Structures are given as structure tokens and as C-alpha cells.
Amino acid sequence: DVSGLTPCKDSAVFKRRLDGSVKKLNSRLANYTEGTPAYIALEQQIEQTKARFAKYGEKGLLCGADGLPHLIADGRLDHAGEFIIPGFGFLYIAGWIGWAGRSYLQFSKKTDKPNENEIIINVPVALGMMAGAFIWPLAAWKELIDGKLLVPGDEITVSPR
Amino acid sequence: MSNDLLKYLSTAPVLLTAWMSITAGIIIEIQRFFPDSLSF
Amino acid sequence: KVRVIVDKDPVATSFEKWAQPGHFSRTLAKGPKTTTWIWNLHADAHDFDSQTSSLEDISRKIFSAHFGQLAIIFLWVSQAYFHGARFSNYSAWLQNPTAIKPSAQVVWPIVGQEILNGDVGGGFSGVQITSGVFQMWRASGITNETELYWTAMGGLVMSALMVFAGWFHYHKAAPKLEWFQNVESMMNHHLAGLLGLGCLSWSGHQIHISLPINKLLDAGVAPQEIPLPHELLFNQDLMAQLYPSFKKGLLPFFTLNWSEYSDFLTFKGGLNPITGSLWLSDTAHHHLALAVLFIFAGHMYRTNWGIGHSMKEILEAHKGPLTGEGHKGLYEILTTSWHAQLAINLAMMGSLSIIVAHHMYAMPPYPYIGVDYPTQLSLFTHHMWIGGFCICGAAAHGAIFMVRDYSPVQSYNNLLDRVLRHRDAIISHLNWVCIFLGTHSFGFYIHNDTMRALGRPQDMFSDKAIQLQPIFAKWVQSLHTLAPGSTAPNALATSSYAFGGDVVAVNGKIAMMPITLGTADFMVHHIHAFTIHVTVLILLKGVLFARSSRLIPDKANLGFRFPCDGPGRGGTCQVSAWDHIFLGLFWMYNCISVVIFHFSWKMQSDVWGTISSSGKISHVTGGNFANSALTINGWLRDFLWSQASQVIQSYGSALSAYGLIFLGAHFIWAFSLMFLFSGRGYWQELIESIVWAHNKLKLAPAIQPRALSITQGRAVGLAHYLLGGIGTTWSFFLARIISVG
Amino acid sequence: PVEYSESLPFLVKRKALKGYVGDVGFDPLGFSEILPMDWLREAELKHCRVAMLATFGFGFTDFWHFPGFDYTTLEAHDACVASGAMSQLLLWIGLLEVFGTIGIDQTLRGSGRAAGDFGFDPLGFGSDPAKMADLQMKELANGRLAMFAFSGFVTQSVLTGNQFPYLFDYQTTDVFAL
Amino acid sequence: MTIPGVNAPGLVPATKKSVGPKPEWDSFRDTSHFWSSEGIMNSVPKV
Amino acid sequence: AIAKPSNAVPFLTAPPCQSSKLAGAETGFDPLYLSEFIDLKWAREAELKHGRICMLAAPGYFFQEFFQLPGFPGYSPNGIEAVSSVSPEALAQIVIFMSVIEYNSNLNKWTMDTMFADPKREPGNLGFDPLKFGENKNTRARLEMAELKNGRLAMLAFSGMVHQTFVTGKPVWASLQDIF
Ligand code: CLA
Ligand code: CLA
Ligand code: CLA
Ligand SMILES: CC1=C(C#C/C(C)=C/C=C/C(C)=C/C=C/C=C(C)/C=C/C=C(C)/C=C/[C@@]23O[C@]2(C)C[C@@H](O)CC3(C)C)C(C)(C)C[C@H](O)C1
Ligand code: SF4
């Protein structure tokens, strides 16, 4: 409904695309005989195509005039699954990765040989940091409040202005 | 095997290759079991 | 005396130096302080001459590294044979080669990439191959998959044996420098022992297993009823039924009645009408004659017995008035320096690969390979590229020898010294040659474009306005066409049908056809000459001015690869022989690209196509080369724009992979220009800003990040440029030829 | 003083086989010079033990089988691979062999473990050190016999098509005739 | 399931196939897992 | 001739866990020598947590076929289609309860160093003992070893129950009684 789009369930162009894909495979199907590995594999291909189209219809995606799904990314919760939920998932995973890296760097510097610790990873403690980074949003907030996330400004080199 | 071979396997490129192969395997198997997921 | 002397247990087998990454280099052994250490590790990984100072240790390392390379090559041959055995339609293709498309790779269904498993015929779905291995195995006589499986297992065993040998000859029993420097014995064994017995054994295999199986297959016997090779090997009755001369045994060989074997040892020439390829009897006779030639050649050089030549005296005896001492000292140079040997061997290997490319297309050696148009184009282009790369490696290692292993004491007044003493004249004359050749050759094209745009076709350098005919090429073609009667009486047909004669065709497709030369061929050949000459100019200047130049008298002190010698003297950028190689790689890329484009367009317009029953010849592009190859506009329109259709229109089909690789290769080629144009100072300042951003969050690494070195930036740009260009041409040629042929 | 093999008395002793059970000097092709004796002997004992079990199992399955497995010795492997009862052996023997490769790694690095010693001696046969050397030699003798025994079992079974004895039909009559 | 011992015999006697003529080398070579084109394909793990 | 053989795998060297004071150390079972790499206290904290979860799960999985919570909707005798059919906002509340317990018990101690930063803090000693069995120190070792063994057996038992249900499609008791 938004921006003149319509759901893919009642989308004639979407249905035509589904039938075109099905007809293309079934044509290619003529070369091979019944019961062969290629024949059964193409049957899997047709089933997966039909399943994908049915799932796209059921999920409530909006299909444009071209008959392809269009994703709405503005904040509306009617289409949260398009961007908002994957967005938070990625943000959590990326912060996990960054926190594991940062905490391992904090450890490795305190070591006697930080330069060799960077190219030969202490895996027993590195896995520990990867595990402990699961709670990074609280850990990051705690370190920020304790003044240990940011290095002060005049303790970092800066070039001649 | 030994401390030496464990250190070598703990070297940076070997660990990156192993970890990225594991990640690619996870992504590929997730694609196999939940194929064609355009949205949540 | 030539003898075997080795050191027992020279190195211990341990992982401590696996753990220690930069153990080999004195500077890198300390540890990393910047990210440049990581790059220097890989750059100096295989520089044994810089790592150590003992020629014995360098030779041992090189020998075992060669063993490792042989192991990798054996694994590669194993992959070819095993994939043919398991994931290929070789049986269907063997039953019906003309109709079935060869294919030996299957993709799994994961992300919809199963579309790449296109319809290749024979009830098989996979990715079409263009390596010619199917035709290779058909020539070899393999008719079933058990044979492919077992030779793959044998290749795996050989690869394991090579890895074991490489370990053994460095860690358990390493030879000595005295053993390594026995060049005369090495040449004797490689001529008589490697090449001679290799040719002899291949000739025996052909005569016993390949002629019968291929003759039966051409007659019409399906592969199931073919007698097995172990039966054919000892069943002399069947071999006599096929080739009657086999009933006479080996007495006509031991007595010199060699003419009795005329049936299976022939000199027919031409191409077999059935398979449209060279006669396998001719191939067997060829390899047998070469075996005799190489075994004869390999008894030249001296060894433990009195008889034999010595390369030292042979070289020292060759000196003339205009050369002073002549070839004195070159034996010592080539016995002491590995880089000189690498240079000569790489130059010959690359030129030989180019010769292989030029010969295989003109004389299709394997059955049903001529009609397999993707295979011919792929093999030609591949071997041309490998040849160019090897030639530039030859130049690079010649420069390395000049920088490192050169010394006037040994070369006082020899050919190397005399060449260095007039390098200026050499390079200036080659510079004039390059300017003259390029001006004339490309000005023909530009003149033609200008006249066509001005609407003056009568003023063109065309076949009908101002002809530039290749009279000498036409004369040589005429001589080669008349050769089988006059100058090669025992040969029944021409060596190649490209010079002239009949139009060999299998089914509808044309295997070979005479290639006519005209004005466009004149122009493109002179373009080839110009490109080769400029590449030689760059590489030869890099080699000659490696020691020093009028700009930097002490260039040798800086090293082989160094960024510059500062902005003094107006700027000394890219003065190194390494940078000369970096510039010459662009030029060989241009040369080989133009050569393969010429080959592709000429063969699709004038040889490849189909011939009807009435004799009508219809070509892929329709003979447009002779009239459209006269202008750069015609090259852009009728070759690039016209033949890019099959690539750009490939989405949603089996060639969608070729379309994707086309776009990705374009992307990488464009990406390379960043490194090629930009400079390290900008990127170092940008990295400083990013390092500040990381330090603000207390995660700046202990290994401080740095912009890549200047030499590394040039190398990265060149590598990405070459990868992008070669990938673009690879996808374009493969998509076009698979679609149309 | 020069040492000659007790099995090939026209060759010089290898000198790498010292201090091992079954040391008649049979090593004409000099594998001990290249590979380590610990690895070679662990392989020997593994082959010996697997071959003893295999030659007993082949003959046993020629006579008796469990109710679920109604296959002959030759097609038993294929039938049980299809059924999934060979994966259940490869998973529970592969666990054992994972522990085994850890063990052979340790003994090659010099932990103290012998070539093929796992310590598996529940019933106490040979716990006296005097009998252990003799029992080790007897183990090697029986295993090296069982290797040829199993090889003959399989090859003759396929070649003849006969169940237990692996003998041609004409060999069951007139085999002691003048 | 036939639990051997409680609801089934512990060990069933094997089928005695009787002593008879030998097979042919081609007969058991064109069905082997390593010297037969289809035997090789029947030797891939099904899984 | 191993100097310090493992009490469980006597053809392998003694792992670091064998020479330690946690409970059940003598077995010395560590063929992969993961006690050398992983922190030993952190792994007993994980072992005990997993065993406690699994020995709540295994009786639950085995008795949910027999018994139903009176009036519960979406009940199925087999756990897998049971979780498939049960309303999501019941599993969500169970997970929220578990998460609340975990967070409040492990407040400010979620990493290998932060947990066991306190020397007193023992592996798996979260302090849950309302009836105070731990005051009696004579049977503390017996109870610790019994907890460890029962937790391990419960992990294996729950794994077996779940995978047998996957194999058969039927609940644990039905699948078992259809063998005999
Ligand atoms: C017989 C072949 C041969 C041999 C034995 C050597 C040996 C050597 N060369 Mg090389 N060289 C060769 C061929 C050979 N070269 C060729 C054909 C060329 C022309 C291009 C060169 C050009 C050349 C130069 C210009 C230089 C060397 C140097 C060296 C030395 C160090 C190399 C090193 O450590 O690299 C270790 C390996 C690497 C650093 C990896 C290289 C990776 C390449 C650039 C890209 C690979 C791309 C891949 C195939 C495709 C990617 C696909 C994508 C989709 C992922 C060493 C003595 C250097 C030296 O100092 O010599 C004394 C040097 O400066 N060589
Ligand atoms: C299209 C792009 C282009 C052009 C035009 C040139 C041109 C040239 N390069 Mg090349 N070069 C290129 C790309 C190009 N390069 C790139 C991308 C690189 C980086 C890898 C290099 C790197 C490079 C090196 C390192 C070297 C060259 C050399 C040369 C010269 C070769 C000699 C020759 O034939 O001169 C003749 C001129 C041409 C072929 C250009 C077109 C000529 C037309 C037909 C007109 C000529 C007639 C008349 C005089 C002028 C027209 C009328 C006018 C008054 C309006 C020439 C000036 C070599 C050199 O200097 O050798 C002496 C050399 O060493 N180039
Ligand atoms: C890992 C633990 C676990 C998990 C994840 C679940 C999950 C589930 N159970 Mg439960 N269940 C468990 C253990 C578990 N159960 C145990 C141990 C029993 C006793 C045999 C039961 C008995 C049971 C029944 C009878 C039923 C379920 C059902 C369910 C489902 C709905 C929730 C519900 O009604 O719970 C009900 C929960 C209970 C009746 C009691 C749970 C016992 C907790 C875990 C013990 C912890 C507290 C501790 C002992 C007290 C300390 C005291 C101290 C302070 C002094 C859900 C799938 C329903 C079903 O079948 O849906 C398909 C259902 O009807 N469960
Ligand atoms: C010793 C040694 C080694 C070894 C070894 C080897 C080769 C060991 C081999 C052991 C072997 C061969 C062990 C078989 C067991 C079979 C069992 C338990 C069968 C169960 C069968 C069951 C539970 C059921 C069968 C059924 O038919 C029933 C009853 C009913 C039917 O409806 C169908 C089914 C299928 C359900 C190392 C590790 C390689 C090296 C080391 O150095 C030395
Ligand atoms: S950019 Fe590099 S090569 Fe050019 S003058 Fe500066 S330092 Fe020298």
C-alpha cells in the first residue's frame, strides 16, 4: 500500500514470474530421462523455486510494477523484518566482534611481547575474549562510565596543526 | 601435536584461514537449511 | 671425476622454525614492529641468495623446492584425471564426440548456482570444460573410467613420492655443490635420459596402445567392444590383423629393413579426415625419431670416461675480432649463478610455449579438437599468456644476475662487458626502431580511420585502395603448399592446411582451412612487431642499465628493487631494473592481448565455421576481418562490441558465471588503477588519521600499521591490472566461443 | 666386527633394528633407515592385530551370523555399508584411532610409551616381565601369519566361490593321487 | 527389532552355498569396486 | 615407560587436570589435553552448569510424555513437537526466567578473568543451598562427586533421548518399548 506498491500475494506480475521460472526449468527438463540424478535434481530445483515464491507471498513483501519484492526501510513496524530486526542482529554481532578484538588488544599489550602476541594469537585466552564479548553492550557502558573506553585527548599523538 | 606445532597453528594466517572456513561453512549450511530468506 | 657426494642429516626436522616466522631473514628474525614486516616476509620468502651466502645451501634449497613443485604438478594432473573419471561425461563424449559437449566439473546446489550445471549432452549436467583433456585421453587410448581412476591414484602416489623426495634431499641426504655443478652429466642425462627415453617410451605406448584403439574407434567399434590395452600389448595376432607389418616382429628393426614398418610408421602429413587431427602413426614416427635424436644428442658432453666435449673449451674457442675474448667466463658465470640459468631457461620456456600455441592451432594433434572451437582458442590464448609471462621473468632474472652475481674480474672484456660498453648505442637504435615501427604501423590504422570518417575509402590502406600485400608471407605459403611434391617427396600432404590445400571438415564444422593473408594481416603483423620491439626495449634497458646509468652511477649499490634515489636530478623515479620489469609487464600484456585478439577474429572470420554438402562455406562472423580490421573503429565495433553480446546477454543461463567474471574482472582492473596512480605519502597520512581514531578508543595495534612500500604498491597495482585484464579476456573469449561454436 | 642378518646372511645388518622383538634382521629394502622404528613397529602391530581379527571374523561369518545380518562374507561389507553398520564401526574405531594417533605422536616425541603398548592387559597374561618378551614374540608371529592368512582367505574366496576352505572343486578329491 | 538371544536365536547358521564350479575372472572383475566403471560409482559414500 | 601416565588412558601422559584439586580429578580423562588450554576452574563451572541443566532436562523430557501440567495447551507427548506446538510466549518466559537467574547470579562476572577474579569463588559454587547440606563437611566430597557424575550421565542421557526421538519420531518410552 505504501508508495503505490501491493502485496506479492495479489501480484499478477509476481505470479507470471513464478510460472515463467517453472516453465523454463520444466523445459530444460526434457533433455534428461525419468529417475536420473539430473532429473531428480531438477525436480528439487522446481520445488525450491515454488517454495521460495510461496514463502515470499506469505511473508507479506510488497511487489512493485516490475513484479519483484521491494523492501521498505523507514522505521514502520509493519515491515520491521526487512531492516530493523536484521539491523539489530548485525549491530549485536558486529559489536561482539569489535569487543572481542578490543579486549584481546587490551590483554596483549600488557604482555611481555605484544608484537609477537599479535601475529601469534594466544588462542586459549582469545577464545575467552570471544566468549566474554557476548555481553558487550553492558561491558562497553561500564567501561565508558569508568573512563576506560576512551583515551583522553592529549595522550594520543596528533600532528602539527 | 607439540608446543611448536600448536604455536604454528596459532599463527595469524592459519588461524584466519581456519576461522573464515568455519564462518563460510556456517553461512553455507545456514543457507542450505533456511534457503532464500529475503527478510525476517 | 663425476660422482655422488652428499651430506647426511644436514637439517633437523622440527616445528620450532615453523613457529618462528621470519627465521630465514636476519632482519625479520628479530620480530615485527610495523606491518611492512609482514609484507617483507612474503617478499623475501624464496630469496635464498639474500637469505644465505652458501651456494651449496642455495642449491639444496632449490632442489627440494623443485621436488615440492613437482608434487603440486602431480596433484594437478591427478585432479584432471580424477575429475574426468568421476564428475564427467567422458563415456558419452567418447561414444559421440561431435554432439556431446565435454564437461568434467559439477557445482553443488547451494545459492542457486546449480544453473551453472548446464545441458552438455549425454544426460549429464555440469560446467563445460575447455582444456582439451578429453581429446588428450582419446589420443592416449583411454576408453573407460577405471583407467582414469587408476592413473589418478598413481598420480597421487607420485605426488606423495615427490613430497618424500623433497624432504629426503634436504633433511636426510642433501647433495654438495660439486654434485650440483656437474652440468655436463646433467645435460647428458636430460638429453638422453629424460627427453630421449621419454620420447622412446611415449612412442612405444603409441605404437602398442594408441594406434589400435584409435583406428578401431575411427572404424566404428564402440568403446565397449575395444580389446583392452593389456590384450593388445602382447596379442601379436590382433596387432597383425590391424597393422600387417606387426607379424614380421622385431627382425625388420634389428636388420635394417625399416621400410617394413611403413604401415604404422608413416609420413602422411596433413590431418586425418575422420577425426580432423594429425595422424597418430605420424605422431609415433615423430616421437621415435626424436627419441633417436635426443639419445644421440646426449652423448656429447664429457663425464667419467675420456670421450666427450667440454662446454668451457667450446665457449672459450668461440671468439672473433669484433668480440675480443668472446665467450670466455660464461661457463663460470652459468656454473656459479642460478639467476643466469633461470633467465635463459625462462626465456626459452616462454618462447617455446608461444611456439606450442602457434603450432597446436595450425596442426590439431588430438582427435576432434579442431571442431572443438573452445578448446583451440583456450589453449592458444593460455599458452601465449604463459609465454609472455615467462619471457618477462627471464628479463627480470637477467637483471637480478646483473645486479648481484656480475663481477668484472671474471668478465673482463668478454661479451657481457662489451655489451655493457655500448648499451647506449643498443638502446638508442632499438628506440629508433620502436618509434619508426609504431609510427608506421599504427599510422596506417589512424590514416584509414581518418579517411573512412572523411568519406574517402579510395585513399585507404585497404586491399582495394592502397594495397600493402605480404608478398614474402604469400611466397612462403606457396612454397609450403608445393613442398609435398617437390621438396618433401615422401610426404603425401602439407604439414599444415593453413598454408593451402583442401578444407578439412568433420561433420559440418571446419577443422582446418587455408588462412589467406592480405593488407589487414600486414598491418596487424607489423603491430605485433612494434609491440614486441617496445617490450624488448623496456626489458633490455632494464637489464643493461641495472648496474648503473648516466643518471645514477652507483645504481648497483642500491640493489635490484629499490623505490628511487630521491627527487634529485629532476627525479629518479622507477630507475630500478625491477621497475623496468614492472613497466615491461604492461607492454607484454598489450602485446599478447593484441595477438590473441588477432587470432580470435581471424579464425572466426576466416577458418572456423560450417561447410554444407554443396560446398558453401559459412564462417562465424562472415569474413568481416579482411575489410573491418583496417580501422580501429572496425576493431572496436565488429570485434569488441559485436562479440560482447554473448557475454553481456549471459545472465540467467549457464554462461552467467562468465558474465559475472566479466564484470568482476572489469572491477579488478579498475581497482588496480588506484595503486598504479596513487602514492604512499597520501595513504600514510590517511592511515595516521585512522590510527588516531583507533587510539581514541584504545585499540591501536602494537604492530603499527603502515602504507605499503612504493615497490609493493607498484607490484599490487600491476598484479591487479594483469588479473583484471586477463580475466576480462578469459570470460569474454570463453562465453563467446561456447555460445557460438 | 661386521654384523650380518640372521635371515639374509649375505647382507650387512641394518643396525637400526637393535633392541626390538623379532629381530632376525629381515629388512632388505631398508625402511628402518628412512622411517622411525617406533612408527614402523606401531604400524606392524596395528596390521597384525587387525589381520588376526579379520582372519578370525571372515571364517566365523562364513559359518554363523546374527539374525539381522543375512549376508555372505563377500557382500557383507556392501550390505552393512548400505545398512549403516559400518559407519558405526568407523565412528567407534575412529574414536579409538584418534586416541591412537595421540599416543603414537606422544611416543614418537618421546613420552615413554613403547611402539604398540597400550597397557591393555585386563586378564594379566604376561604381567610377569619374563613372559612378556616371549608373548610379544608370539603376538608378532601369530599376527604376521594372520596377515597372509587373511590375504589368502579373501583372494581364494573370490577366486574359487567356495565358502570356508577356499578350495577349488577339484581340490576336494584325488589331491593325493599317483 | 530382533534382539539376538531373547526374541531371536543368538547366531543363525550361514547359508552353505555348496562346492561348485569357479567363477570367471572377467565375471568378478567387471563388478569390482576398483576395476569396474559402475563399481567405482557404487563405491562413493551415499550419505 | 610413561613417567606420569593418565589414570584413565594409561598409554598417555598425565593431563594437567589430573594434578589438580577439583572433584573427580583422578580419573584423569583428557585425551585431547584441553585442560592445558582451557582454564580448569572455568570449565568446571561450565561442566556443573551443563550437568545441572541436563539433569533437570532428562527427567523433564522423560516424564513429560507420561504426565501433563493440568490444562496446559499445545501439549504433545514428545518434546520436539511439544516445543513446536507450545505457545512462543511460554518458552519466552522460561528463557527470561533463566536469563534473569544467570544475570543476577553472575553480575559483573561473565568473563574467564572476572569470574574467579575472587580467589574464594569456587567452580560452580553459586551459593544455592537453602537446606544447608554444605555445612556438613564430612559428606561434601561425596555429594560433589555424585553431582558431577549424575550431571555427566544426565548430559549423555538427554542427548540420547533427543536423538532417539529424532530417529524414531516417537517419545522415549514408546521408542524403548517398541524394541523389546
Ligand atoms: C621458474 C620460475 C621462477 C622462479 C624460480 C623465480 C624465483 C624468484 N623470483 Mg621470480 N619471476 C618469475 C618466475 C620465477 N621467479 C616470472 C615468470 C616473473 C615475471 C612476472 C618473475 C618476476 C620476478 C621479479 C620482478 C622478482 C622476482 C623475484 C624472485 C625471487 C623471490 C620470489 C618470492 O619470494 O616470491 C614469493 C611469492 C610471492 C611473493 C607471491 C607472489 C604472488 C603473485 C604476485 C600473484 C599470484 C596471483 C595468482 C596466481 C592468482 C590470484 C587469483 C585471484 C582471483 C585470487 C625468486 C628468486 C624477486 C627478487 O628479488 O628476485 C631476486 C623479484 O623482485 N621474480
Ligand atoms: C594509447 C596510449 C599510449 C600511447 C599513444 C603511447 C605511446 C608511446 N609509448 Mg607507451 N605507454 C602506455 C600507453 C601509450 N603509449 C601506457 C598505458 C604505459 C604504461 C604502462 C606506457 C608505457 C610506456 C613505456 C615505458 C614506453 C612507452 C613507449 C611509447 C612510445 C613507443 C614508440 C612509438 O611507437 O612512438 C610513436 C608514437 C605512437 C605510436 C603514438 C601514435 C602515433 C601516430 C600514428 C602519429 C604519428 C605521426 C606524427 C609524428 C604525429 C601525428 C600528427 C600530429 C602533429 C597532430 C610512444 C610515444 C616507449 C618509448 O618511448 O619508446 C621509444 C617506452 O619506453 N610507453
Ligand atoms: C530443562 C528443564 C526443563 C525445560 C526446559 C522444560 C520445558 C517444558 N516443560 Mg517441563 N519439566 C521439567 C523440566 C523442564 N521442562 C521437569 C524436571 C519436570 C518434572 C518431571 C517437568 C515436567 C513437566 C510437565 C508435566 C509438563 C512440562 C511441560 C513443559 C513445557 C511448558 C512449561 C511448563 O509447563 O513447565 C512445567 C514445569 C514444571 C511442572 C516443573 C519444572 C521443574 C523445575 C525445572 C525444577 C527447578 C526448581 C527447583 C527444583 C526448586 C528448588 C527449591 C529450593 C528453593 C528449596 C516446556 C517445553 C508441559 C508439556 O508437556 O508441554 C509440552 C507439561 O505439561 N514439564
Ligand atoms: C584392536 C585394534 C584396533 C581395531 C579394531 C577392529 C577392526 C575392531 C572391530 C570390531 C567389531 C567388528 C565390532 C563389532 C561390533 C558389533 C556390534 C556391537 C553389533 C551390534 C548390533 C546391533 C545393536 C543390532 C543389529 C541388528 O540386527 C539386529 C540385532 C536387529 C535387526 O533388526 C537389525 C539391527 C541392525 C538393528 C584398532 C583401533 C584399529 C587399532 C589398535 O591398535 C588395535
Ligand atoms: S614519488 Fe616516489 S619515485 Fe617519485 S620522486 Fe617521490 S619518492 Fe621518488
Coordinates of C-alpha atoms in Angstrom, one line a residue, chain C residues 375-553:
Chain C
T375 CA 39.5 -25.8 -26.8
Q376 CA 41.6 -24.4 -29.6
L377 CA 41.0 -20.8 -28.6
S378 CA 41.6 -21.5 -24.9
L379 CA 44.8 -23.5 -25.4
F380 CA 46.3 -20.9 -27.8
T381 CA 45.5 -17.9 -25.6
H382 CA 46.6 -19.7 -22.4
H383 CA 50.0 -20.7 -23.8
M384 CA 50.6 -17.2 -25.3
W385 CA 50.0 -15.6 -21.9
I386 CA 52.3 -18.1 -20.2
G387 CA 54.9 -17.4 -22.8
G388 CA 54.8 -13.7 -22.3
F389 CA 55.0 -14.1 -18.5
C390 CA 58.0 -16.4 -18.8
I391 CA 59.8 -14.0 -21.1
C392 CA 59.4 -11.2 -18.6
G393 CA 60.6 -13.5 -15.9
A394 CA 63.7 -14.1 -18.0
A395 CA 64.4 -10.4 -18.3
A396 CA 63.8 -9.9 -14.5
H397 CA 66.3 -12.7 -13.5
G398 CA 68.8 -11.5 -16.0
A399 CA 68.6 -8.1 -14.3
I400 CA 69.0 -9.8 -10.9
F401 CA 72.1 -11.6 -12.1
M402 CA 73.5 -8.3 -13.4
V403 CA 72.9 -6.6 -10.0
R404 CA 74.1 -9.4 -7.7
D405 CA 76.3 -12.0 -9.4
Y406 CA 78.0 -9.8 -12.0
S407 CA 81.7 -9.1 -11.5
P408 CA 84.3 -7.6 -13.9
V409 CA 87.1 -9.8 -12.7
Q410 CA 85.5 -12.7 -14.4
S411 CA 84.2 -10.7 -17.3
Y412 CA 86.9 -8.5 -18.4
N413 CA 86.5 -7.9 -22.0
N414 CA 84.1 -10.8 -22.7
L415 CA 80.7 -10.4 -24.5
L416 CA 78.9 -9.2 -21.4
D417 CA 81.5 -6.5 -20.8
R418 CA 81.4 -5.5 -24.5
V419 CA 77.6 -5.3 -24.4
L420 CA 77.6 -3.1 -21.3
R421 CA 80.2 -0.8 -23.0
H422 CA 77.8 0.2 -25.8
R423 CA 74.3 -0.4 -24.2
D424 CA 73.7 3.3 -25.1
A425 CA 74.0 2.6 -28.8
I426 CA 72.0 -0.6 -28.4
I427 CA 69.1 1.1 -26.6
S428 CA 69.1 4.2 -28.8
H429 CA 68.9 2.1 -32.0
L430 CA 66.1 0.0 -30.6
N431 CA 64.4 3.2 -29.5
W432 CA 64.5 4.5 -33.1
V433 CA 63.2 1.1 -34.3
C434 CA 60.3 1.3 -31.9
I435 CA 59.4 4.8 -32.9
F436 CA 59.6 4.1 -36.7
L437 CA 57.7 0.8 -36.4
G438 CA 55.0 2.1 -34.2
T439 CA 54.5 5.3 -36.1
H440 CA 54.1 3.5 -39.4
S441 CA 52.1 0.5 -38.2
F442 CA 49.6 2.5 -36.1
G443 CA 49.5 5.4 -38.5
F444 CA 48.2 3.0 -41.2
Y445 CA 45.2 2.4 -38.8
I446 CA 44.8 6.1 -38.0
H447 CA 45.0 7.1 -41.6
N448 CA 42.4 4.5 -42.5
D449 CA 40.1 5.7 -39.7
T450 CA 40.5 9.4 -40.8
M451 CA 39.8 8.6 -44.5
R452 CA 36.8 6.5 -43.6
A453 CA 35.4 9.3 -41.4
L454 CA 36.1 11.8 -44.2
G455 CA 34.3 9.6 -46.7
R456 CA 37.4 8.8 -48.8
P457 CA 37.6 4.9 -49.0
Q458 CA 39.7 5.3 -52.1
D459 CA 42.6 6.8 -50.0
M460 CA 42.7 3.9 -47.5
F461 CA 45.4 1.4 -46.9
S462 CA 42.9 -1.3 -47.9
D463 CA 43.0 -4.4 -50.1
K464 CA 41.4 -2.3 -53.0
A465 CA 42.6 1.3 -52.4
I466 CA 46.4 1.2 -51.5
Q467 CA 47.4 -2.5 -51.1
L468 CA 50.1 -3.5 -48.6
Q469 CA 50.4 -7.1 -49.6
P470 CA 52.6 -9.6 -47.6
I471 CA 54.4 -10.8 -50.6
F472 CA 57.0 -12.8 -48.6
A473 CA 54.4 -14.5 -46.4
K474 CA 52.4 -15.4 -49.5
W475 CA 55.6 -16.8 -51.2
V476 CA 56.4 -18.9 -48.1
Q477 CA 52.8 -20.2 -48.1
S478 CA 53.1 -21.1 -51.7
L479 CA 56.4 -22.9 -51.1
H480 CA 54.9 -24.9 -48.2
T481 CA 51.9 -25.8 -50.3
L482 CA 54.1 -27.1 -53.1
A483 CA 56.5 -28.8 -50.7
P484 CA 54.8 -32.3 -50.6
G485 CA 55.6 -32.9 -54.2
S486 CA 59.0 -31.2 -54.8
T487 CA 61.0 -30.6 -51.6
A488 CA 59.3 -33.3 -49.4
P489 CA 58.7 -36.1 -51.8
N490 CA 58.0 -38.8 -49.2
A491 CA 55.4 -36.5 -47.5
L492 CA 51.9 -37.0 -49.1
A493 CA 50.2 -33.9 -47.8
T494 CA 51.2 -30.5 -46.4
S495 CA 52.5 -30.1 -42.9
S496 CA 49.5 -27.7 -42.2
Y497 CA 46.4 -26.8 -44.2
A498 CA 46.7 -23.2 -43.1
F499 CA 49.3 -22.6 -45.9
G500 CA 46.9 -24.1 -48.5
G501 CA 45.2 -27.2 -49.9
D502 CA 41.8 -28.7 -49.1
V503 CA 39.4 -27.6 -46.4
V504 CA 39.4 -30.3 -43.7
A505 CA 35.9 -30.7 -42.1
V506 CA 34.4 -33.2 -39.7
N507 CA 30.6 -33.4 -39.9
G508 CA 29.6 -29.8 -40.6
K509 CA 32.2 -27.8 -38.7
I510 CA 35.5 -27.0 -40.3
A511 CA 38.6 -28.3 -38.5
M512 CA 41.2 -26.5 -40.6
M513 CA 41.1 -24.2 -43.7
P514 CA 43.7 -22.2 -45.6
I515 CA 44.4 -18.8 -44.0
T516 CA 44.8 -16.1 -46.6
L517 CA 46.9 -13.0 -45.8
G518 CA 46.3 -9.5 -47.0
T519 CA 46.5 -5.9 -46.1
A520 CA 44.9 -6.3 -42.7
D521 CA 47.3 -9.2 -41.9
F522 CA 50.2 -7.0 -42.9
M523 CA 49.1 -4.2 -40.6
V524 CA 48.4 -6.5 -37.6
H525 CA 51.7 -8.3 -38.1
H526 CA 53.6 -5.0 -38.1
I527 CA 51.7 -4.1 -34.9
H528 CA 52.8 -7.3 -33.4
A529 CA 56.4 -6.5 -34.4
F530 CA 56.1 -3.0 -32.9
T531 CA 54.7 -4.3 -29.6
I532 CA 57.4 -7.0 -29.3
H533 CA 60.1 -4.4 -30.0
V534 CA 58.9 -2.0 -27.4
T535 CA 58.7 -4.8 -24.8
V536 CA 62.3 -5.8 -25.7
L537 CA 63.3 -2.1 -25.4
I538 CA 61.9 -1.8 -21.9
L539 CA 63.3 -5.2 -20.7
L540 CA 66.7 -4.8 -22.4
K541 CA 67.1 -1.3 -21.0
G542 CA 66.3 -2.6 -17.5
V543 CA 68.8 -5.4 -17.8
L544 CA 71.6 -3.3 -19.4
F545 CA 71.2 -0.3 -17.0
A546 CA 70.8 -2.5 -13.9
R547 CA 74.4 -1.8 -12.8
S548 CA 74.4 2.0 -13.4
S549 CA 73.4 4.8 -15.8
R550 CA 74.3 8.3 -16.6
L551 CA 71.7 9.4 -14.0
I552 CA 72.9 7.1 -11.1
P553 CA 76.5 5.9 -11.4

